[PDB]
Design a protein around this ligand. Structure first.
Ligand SMILES: *[C@@](O)(CO)[C@H](C[C@@H]1CCNC1=O)NC(=O)[C@H](CC(C)C)NC(=O)c1cc2c(OC)cccc2[nH]1
Ligand SMILES: *[C@@](O)(CO)[C@H](C[C@@H]1CCNC1=O)NC(=O)[C@H](CC(C)C)NC(=O)c1cc2c(OC)cccc2[nH]1
Ligand SMILES: [Cl-]
Lengths: 303, 301
């Protein structure tokens, strides 16, 4: 009963967050086994940040140049390497609270939980989606760098995002835990624009099924559409094309509600062409696209 | 800003969640020091649930009828009592993960994080607002009662909600950690209707202050009002009347922007009587009422 933007419980990640300081720069790090992972621009200065030759700046640093603090305990750095935009600080102590984990690179349209952290301390947790243009619409303030995004499957934490940047438009950019940015961004102190964003169509459809499962059907109609005719209209409105894989992934929700996927597409088509007028869906005046089919299934199955 | 619903990190509460079973009835409990708190209806059999006599059901129970488990590890129950709609089970082990905590009863409009749990295992965390009609718009499946709502201040967890009921309309109802329901509801297997809901005025005002902090201030007018005058008008638009506490918790935002609370109230009054006239505030044509003055500062600071 009910439907809400839900994040995974953050405890397993809270126990990995530490504070990393180099010179006058302080941000968050992720302590897994005997390594602390953080954004490499912590080794920058105020001047370096506009065009940093990271390899050149890193060689000039010593292990003792890195102050790592887990609570009221200082961790001794005994090694340091760089993997793309991620600094890897070897410490003399394995984190005793390390969970079962892996590093994964998430795909656009997929969701993850963000643990926002400042000075190594967790501050809040919320759910985000990888936008088609590889930005995320996060909530990050000064000092949030090194905050991580993750999913949980059973006891396994899959880390997928580390936070680096805010764009002039207010959306955010970061890397996976191998230090590769999502999108065309670069960890230099410059104003960067993203590619034109699109709406995550399969997620909007999942969310419409959620609204039906929660007893709201005002947007349904008797009509049906072909996949291609739907995609022509969606593309006109800057919606991502719906693939057959997307159609299949929506199977369960379609079965649960007995509304054919292409039947829901006809409803979305009508919503795009006419608008919602004054009405709302699941409390929103806008078409929500940051719930995946799985998000909806986990909250609405058997409901 | 980028105003999202943001929950508190849930780890301190995860370490307190257990499952409690009586017969085949299982739900969640909260293990703090050597006490486990849980909804008293765990002692009901499927059939008792329509109009239980809890005092009578409970006199027929002994400590050894209660199965409390942290994961798969049983915690022996050595004492039991009922306090309103909550059962308190004394166990022989003090929870080593017990945080600093208090039990607080919140006012309508206040927000809190809900850690949804099933069979003692946390599954998700999200932010809720206590509606003026004492419901919350949660996301709760079978097996969710005993899940708790909380705030975190410094290192201290303030527990404010324990889940008990879903209403016919799909909203949710529950108690504080002393077992006292929010609103007129009771822990019975019966359809219970919530009063008509109203908009949380104090939070709308917080949201307007947030808009002003962000340079979005077209709606400010050069008027002020009395609190009485505003309340009388607000009620005609199904808005909650403001209290002195509401005026007080808006103080920091009023000082930050230099706009007196009653001046902001006159601006809201004009929006109510005239509408948005096809404009948006913070990007939305809807006025948001689920961010408290604290949430605003917190997300902006
Ligand atoms: C990290 O905390 C830095 O350690 C920080 C996160 C942002 C601060 C405000 N909100 C955030 O998400 N990241 C930065 O400050 C990065 C640092 C780079 C990678 C060296 N830079 C930016 O986010 C950045 C720079 C510029 C800019 O130039 C100058 C112009 C416009 C936007 C912009 N963002
Ligand atoms: C707890 O998990 C029970 O342990 C459960 C929470 C709901 C399950 C689905 N979503 C929830 O939020 N609570 C209940 O089942 C309670 C049990 C009472 C306290 C004995 N009852 C209800 O939620 C309930 C019963 C009825 C009803 O009857 C008749 C008619 C309409 C609504 C309704 N809700
Ligand atoms: Cl039910």
């Amino acid at each position: 009963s009910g439907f809400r933007k839900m994040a995974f419980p953050s405890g397993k990640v809270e126990g990995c967050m530490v504070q990393v300081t180099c010179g006058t720069t302080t941000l968050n790090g992720l302590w897994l086994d005997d390594v602390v992972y953080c954004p490499r621009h912590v080794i920058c200065t105020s001047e370096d940040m506009f065009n940093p030759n990271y390899e050149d700046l890193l060689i000039r640093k010593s292990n003792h140049n890195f102050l790592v603090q887990a609570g009221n305990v200082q961790l001794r750095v005994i090694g340091h390497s760089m993997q793309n935009c991620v600094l890897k600080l070897k410490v003399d102590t394995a984190n005793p609270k390390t969970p079962k984990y892996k590093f994964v690179r998430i795909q656009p349209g997929q969701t993850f939980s963000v643990l926002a952290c400042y000075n190594g301390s967790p501050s809040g947790v919320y759910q985000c989606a990888m936008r088609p243009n590889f930005t995320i619409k996060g909530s990050f303030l000064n000092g949030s760098c090194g905050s991580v995004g993750f999913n949980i499957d059973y006891d396994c934490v899959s880390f997928c995002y580390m936070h680096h940047m805010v764009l002039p438009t207010g959306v955010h950019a970061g890397t996976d835990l191998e230090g590769n940015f999502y999108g065309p961004f670069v960890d230099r102190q410059t104003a960067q624009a993203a590619g034109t964003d699109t709406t995550i169509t399969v997620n909007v459809l999942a969310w419409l099924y959620a609204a039906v499962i929660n007893g709201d059907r005002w947007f349904l109609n008797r009509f049906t559409t072909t996949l291609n005719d739907f995609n022509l209209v969606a593309m006109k409105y800057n919606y991502e094309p719906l693939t057959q894989d997307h159609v299949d992934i929506l199977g369960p929700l379609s079965a649960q509600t007995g509304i054919a996927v292409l039947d829901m597409c006809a409803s979305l088509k009508e919503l795009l062409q006419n608008g919602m007028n004054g009405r709302t869906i699941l409390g929103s005046a806008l078409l929500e696209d940051e719930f995946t089919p799985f998000d909806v299934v986990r909250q609405c199955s058997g409901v």
